[PDB]
């Protein structure tokens, strides 16, 4: 009977705590007690986390433009792995709620078995890995790129990668071993080879020798998780030299290899490979 | 049940994150913890201020917000984050042209974006950008200007202009020289560093066998080691031998090499040597 009054005062307080969260009225108002406390805690924790790190964090239309300008979501983990922040835009790509993830362990949303590798990346100083995350739109391959701090990750998640090609990007169709099956005739706008002189050979023949090992690791991740993004690598040209590419690749038991052309030819005098002679 | 002990576990940690409430010997009642949190937060676009968000994008992937006009290319807005990312002063970037700030060869692509394509239409492109008072697309030249590879994502939004993030994707850019051989030991690729390492030009090695450049006392070891790295599958095997430079001097040379196995078909693409001077 006194418990009723005590709980009434507690409820009133929960209402207040909900009002003060940095959320829209319409969202915070519809929260339950447990989640009001969770968001309150991790939000104070977030304040602490941005306090640390250099600099301390801090035309006013800016943040809206930043968030809707990224093709992915932005997030910050603590040393444990709990989300201290995730941008509402996660809903665009994974359909998870920002309100649902905030305060939660990232591993509750990573495909298990990528758990080991993710645990390795946080240390449990740049980071860059591919991981499967829970999507409800039954996983999505998410490219994470960010920084570790020596104790918490700050990073961007981008879904991979409908098919809008533009001018400076050639499509390849490759086997699962990266031999060239088909090539856009457009390749000749950026390279010396035509689709006649490329089909039948393996991309490993065209990767500059210094990038063979990086491309290989990317090929591993491609067979492992189904999508991959290479680093900037060099593709050797028929005379000499190479053109720089970055490539996004997805499996369909065949491989789609979208190469953004990053530069014109470089050092085209000196040949490097056998196929560049005579 | 498991829900109530869970919330008390929330509430106590809330007492820890509330200052006026943690600096107590005895933890107060739930109602007072709530009350204290409510006033604490009362003494203080979601979770993060626009400033905070700007600095987070900066920490996460070296990103800065900029706005350009879709026909002239005039930088109508640039974040101050452009200084840590590009080492451009804000004033040099503001009002300048985007076409003047990108690399001479990347202008055509920058012009095929931003040309006339509705409102809220998206743009995404990679293009190099001048640093001024660090490069990331191949070995840095000598006394030339630095150009970092910048990843632009954005949307179209009139008073017609492009709202974008440029962000750096550093984990992509990459005394000795790499080479490739067939299983018989035949040079089928030589990176250019070989000129500076053993004086020769890549084609002056291509097509010949490595043992031909090998001191006669050492040739039997080198033949043996090659036949060995073939039997070793992936694993690396190193050997030191004497290499006849183009100055006809013998250089002691530690080459570690391994057989490069296609991550799908597992066939041998070639043998990757990393030849070093000791």
Author numbering:
A (entry chain B): 52 to 109, 135 to 200, 244 to 256, 267 to 279, 282 to 292, 298 to 388, 397 to 422
B (entry chain A): 99 to 142, 156 to 227, 255 to 271, 290 to 315, 335 to 349, 361 to 464
Could you share sentences copied from the article?
One family of transcription factors in mammals is known as the bHLH-PAS family, which consists of sixteen members including NPAS1 and NPAS3. The mammalian bHLH-PAS transcription factors share a common protein architecture consisting of a conserved bHLH DNA-binding domain, tandem PAS domains (PAS-A and PAS-B), and a variable activation or repression domain. Proteins in the bHLH-PAS family have to form pairs in order to bind to DNA: NPAS1 and NPAS3 both interact with another bHLH-PAS protein called ARNT, but it is not clear exactly how this works. We employed the contiguous bHLH-PAS-A-PAS-B segments of NPAS1, NPAS3 and ARNT proteins for our crystallographic studies.
For the NPAS1-ARNT heterodimer, we obtained crystals that diffracted to 3.2 Å resolution. We found that the bHLH, PAS-A and PAS-B domains of ARNT twist along the outside surface of the NPAS1 protein. Figure 1D shows that NPAS1-ARNT and HIF-2α-ARNT heterodimers are very similar in overall architectures, but the PAS-B domain of ARNT is slightly displaced in the NPAS1 heterodimeric complex. We show that NPAS1 protein’s PAS-A and PAS-B domains do contain internal cavities with volumes measuring 190 Å3 and 180 Å3, respectively. We could not detect any major change in the cavity size or shape of ARNT’s PAS-A and PAS-B pockets, whether this protein was in a complex with HIF-2α or NPAS1. Mutations in interfaces 1–4 were found to significantly destabilize ARNT’s heterodimeric interactions with both NPAS1 and NPAS3, as predicted from their crystal structures. Point mutations within NPAS1 at interfaces 5 and 6 also destabilized heterodimerization with ARNT. NPAS1 has been shown to function as a transcriptional repressor on its target gene tyrosine hydroxylase (TH), since it lacks a functional transactivation domain.
